[PDB]
């Protein structure tokens, strides 16, 4: 279950094990390498894409809100800019509340990830996004979308980001 | 210490490369079948193992069954050779 | 999108020409042809050649290149239309 | 041993021509061992892509034949003895060539049939390209130990004037 | 052979119908995507502005 | 002979124009609806912010 991380993280050691108990066997027991962190790298979505869009692997997205709640996504494909929606069925949203909760794909739509210069978003449902984040990594949104049938993930749908990271299994 | 891993790795690589080879053959067959007949598809994919004594008479039976459709053939034609190991 | 080309060829080349257009396009090409009202005079030798016009129809630039390559193979003259 | 893959239309349905064919090819004499073959329905589209695929899949066929044949040659190169066992090690899907050819199945898990022909083709090309990268690695692993041991054995070989 | 010319015509008519459907399906996919993008985008864009005024 | 091939080629272009043009008209309508329904939700979020401000006042 437990693994080596190349650096410090937003996740506690019990959060790493709770992820390892539920992640795909394609990535279970691999060491995790840091691609991006607001704790060590420039706090913008362009800096996140500059660090993560060069990858070609499964990955983990980790976020802490200003209310100190931990949440994010695991994806089969790197989080990056795109012209269209991308990702595949093992991709899911999650939170620690304080125990781990996971929101696997519904099969309803391809909306796993979309990445734009103006925002990053995960899932979709008309007005809904499973996650949404601004270009500055400051404002967010998160609510139930038909892609994952997810909870609010952050402590509030109206929220401010405290810190954000991207990791790869390698 | 190289030999054991090499033989196991080559077993896996040969399986995957051979499986992938037949998948490309299947795609070539599919794409040509579509281009030959058009989109209201009703073609049968077929496998034959020609006997070396009768391969000439095999071509005559295949022609007799399909000469109305149109090396070259009036049906879609492809091959697989088991001599990869020489 | 769809595309098409038009041109002229020596009429006796038509059976090999149309067969190669079908073959290169893996079966499918639409085309028609028509004999000229007189044979046309060679600009250098003065020989009269019984040419025929053709027009060929297809989808996209990839097939444009295939039909053009067969026209070059039979030394046909293509023109804009 | 050689196999043929064929495709042709039915009279109205795919059964009707094939049902007459396999009887003639097995009942007049054993002209060929004869059966259906397992090709799935795939996401088809414009002639511009289907013709591109026809030539790209041909370049890929030559490439993937080269890759699988190089894997077989590397097995023949590593088996410097017991060469008669090479076919028992060059299995596909855990079975002999003639068996997986005769009993072929499309890998719907590696190649999801709902995807475009272009996507499926690229997935194959990436996989076999990594087999070629693994063959560049494994050649470098094997040929160095082979050459070094041959040179060590040559330094121990011959009379007091050379050993 | 006029019957083989009619087969070639019918073959072309089958491919152009599927090409027309394929292009339409890409534009229909873009329609559903851009709805889910633009509705969520505009809501969040103004919802944040009114939150800042609040 | 020739008139059938002309009519079918003209109808081939017609299919390729129409299916795409209907999809383009749907794309435009869905995008307009996305903006309109977003504004309706924005009015509800505005009304919540105003009610909340009136309560604080």
Swiss-Prot record, chain B:
Reported tissue expression: Expressed in brain (at protein level).
Compartment(s): Cytoplasmic vesicle, Secretory vesicle, Synaptic vesicle membrane; Cytoplasmic vesicle, Clathrin-coated vesicle membrane
Subunit-level organization: V-ATPase is a heteromultimeric enzyme made up of two complexes: the ATP-hydrolytic V1 complex and the proton translocation V0 complex. The V1 complex consists of three catalytic AB heterodimers that form a heterohexamer, three peripheral stalks each consisting of EG heterodimers, one central rotor including subunits D and F, and the regulatory subunits C and H. The proton translocation complex V0 consists of the proton transport subunit a, a ring of proteolipid subunits c9c'', rotary subunit d, subunits e and f, and the accessory subunits ATP6AP1/Ac45 and ATP6AP2/PRR.
Family of the protein in this entry: Belongs to the V-ATPase C subunit family.
Name this polypeptide is given: V-type proton ATPase subunit C 1
Organism (species): Rattus norvegicus (Rat)
Gene giving rise to this polypeptide: Atp6v1c1
First-to-last residue of the parent protein present: 274 to 380 of 382
UniProtKB/Swiss-Prot annotation, chain C:
UniProt subcellular location: Cytoplasmic vesicle, Clathrin-coated vesicle membrane; Cytoplasmic vesicle, Secretory vesicle, Synaptic vesicle membrane; Melanosome
Assembly notes: V-ATPase is a heteromultimeric enzyme made up of two complexes: the ATP-hydrolytic V1 complex and the proton translocation V0 complex. The V1 complex consists of three catalytic AB heterodimers that form a heterohexamer, three peripheral stalks each consisting of EG heterodimers, one central rotor including subunits D and F, and the regulatory subunits C and H. The proton translocation complex V0 consists of the proton transport subunit a, a ring of proteolipid subunits c9c'', rotary subunit d, subunits e and f, and the accessory subunits ATP6AP1/Ac45 and ATP6AP2/PRR. Interacts with SPAAR.
Family: Belongs to the V-ATPase 116 kDa subunit family.
Protein name in the entry: V-type proton ATPase 116 kDa subunit a 1
Taxonomic path: Eukaryota, Metazoa, Chordata, Craniata, Vertebrata
Gene (name only): Atp6v0a1
Interval of the full protein contained in this chain: 167 to 247 of 838
From Swiss-Prot, chain D:
Disulfide bonds: none
Residues with N-acetylthreonine modification: 1
Membrane-crossing residue ranges in chain numbering: none
Coiled coil: none
Tissues in which the protein is found: Expressed in brain (at protein level).
Subcellular location: Cytoplasmic vesicle, Secretory vesicle, Synaptic vesicle membrane; Cytoplasmic vesicle, Clathrin-coated vesicle membrane
Similarity section: Belongs to the V-ATPase C subunit family.
Assembly with partners or alone: V-ATPase is a heteromultimeric enzyme made up of two complexes: the ATP-hydrolytic V1 complex and the proton translocation V0 complex. The V1 complex consists of three catalytic AB heterodimers that form a heterohexamer, three peripheral stalks each consisting of EG heterodimers, one central rotor including subunits D and F, and the regulatory subunits C and H. The proton translocation complex V0 consists of the proton transport subunit a, a ring of proteolipid subunits c9c'', rotary subunit d, subunits e and f, and the accessory subunits ATP6AP1/Ac45 and ATP6AP2/PRR.
Protein name: V-type proton ATPase subunit C 1
Gene this protein is translated from: Atp6v1c1
Curated annotation (Swiss-Prot), chain E:
Superkingdom to which the source organism belongs: Eukaryota
Principal subcellular localisation of the protein: membrane
An MF annotation (GO) of this entry: proton-transporting ATPase activity, rotational mechanism
Residues modified to Phosphotyrosine: 53
Keywords of the record: Acetylation, Cell membrane, Cytoplasmic vesicle, Hydrogen ion transport, Ion transport, Membrane, Phosphoprotein, Synapse, Transport
Subcellular location as annotated: Apical cell membrane; Cytoplasmic vesicle, Secretory vesicle, Synaptic vesicle membrane; Cytoplasmic vesicle, Clathrin-coated vesicle membrane
GO biological process: proton transmembrane transport; synaptic vesicle lumen acidification
GO CC terms of this entry: apical plasma membrane; clathrin-coated vesicle membrane; cytoplasm; cytosol; endosome; extrinsic component of synaptic vesicle membrane; microvillus; vacuolar proton-transporting V-type ATPase, V1 domain
Free-text tissue specificity from the UniProt record: Expressed in brain (at protein level).
Transmembrane portions of the chain: none
Protein's UniProt keywords contain Phosphoprotein: yes
Subunit structure: V-ATPase is a heteromultimeric enzyme made up of two complexes: the ATP-hydrolytic V1 complex and the proton translocation V0 complex. The V1 complex consists of three catalytic AB heterodimers that form a heterohexamer, three peripheral stalks each consisting of EG heterodimers, one central rotor including subunits D and F, and the regulatory subunits C and H. The proton translocation complex V0 consists of the proton transport subunit a, a ring of proteolipid subunits c9c'', rotary subunit d, subunits e and f, and the accessory subunits ATP6AP1/Ac45 and ATP6AP2/PRR.
Gene (UniProt): Atp6v1e1
